[PDB]
Amino acid sequence: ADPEVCCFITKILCAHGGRMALDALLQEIALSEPQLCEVLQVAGPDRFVVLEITRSVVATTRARVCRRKYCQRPCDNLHLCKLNLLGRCNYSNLCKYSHEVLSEENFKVLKNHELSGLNKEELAVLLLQSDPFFMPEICKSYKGEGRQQICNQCSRLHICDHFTRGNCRFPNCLRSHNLMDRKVLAIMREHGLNPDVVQNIQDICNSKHMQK
């Protein structure tokens, strides 16, 4: 409920790689177990994903980076260079995406999502595991696991697209929802996402699937 306490939890979580065991989190926030559990439950799975009895908390957000190459303002999304946010922009010729992570316009977007207290490092951790735009490209010719051809040829992800966006309508979906697969982890690793980050994405995407 309290945005200052919530932002503070997001901050501590992002400093520990977007995930913490409930016990290690309690040691940093200095609250009691059902007192913290009240805050997490009230904030909901759009801010914190709680999984199991050894409990872990995963930070998330509804904030997204605008996907357009050239965006006509006003726009309610963040505008930044993903590569720069991750410290890998080898173009800045001038890059068409902002290198000012906490720009005036982004700062307003963060206030709307109650994340204006974050620094650029915490924002990078949060967005990498919450925003699907940070994920490698998904093979458009992939249609499921029990077919003649898995795809038309490729290097892209052979995973359910809708699952990554939190809207897989199929309850017994035959397109893979397992991002923890060796082949997926190999493509993720080459894109700059390590298995700890993929595990967080997996648990956020699992949570979004169980909440329709």
Interface with Zn ion: number of residues (CB under 5 A):
19
80 binds Zn ion (CB under 5 A): no
- Nearest Cα to Cα of residue 24 among 1, 198, 15, 199: 15
Closest distance of CB 60 from Zn ion, Å? 19
- In angstroms, the Cα distances linking 14 to 8, 82, 147 are 10, 17, 40
Q: Is 86 in the site for Zn ion (CB under 5 A)?
A: no
In the list 20, 40, 81, 115, the residue contacting Zn ion (rule: CB under 5 A) is: 81
- Identified binder of Zn ion from the candidate list 135, 160, 197, 204, rule CB under 5 A: 160
The amino acid occupying position 147 is R
Instruction: Name the minimum Å distance from CB 11 to Zn ion.
Output: 26
66 is a contact residue toward Zn ion (CB under 5 A):
yes
Rule CB under 5 A: say whether 139 interacts with Zn ion: yes
Angstrom distances, CA of residue 134 to CA of 30, 39, 40, 73:
33, 28, 25, 22
Q: For residues 138 and 157, is the Cβ–Cβ distance under 8 A? A: yes
**Which of 192, 154, 150 has the alpha carbon at shortest distance from 175?**
150
- Closest separation in Å from C-beta 211 to Zn ion: 15
* Binding residues for Zn ion (CB under 5 A): 66, 71, 75, 77, 81, 83-84, 89, 95, 97, 139, 151, 154, 156, 160, 163, 168, 173, 175
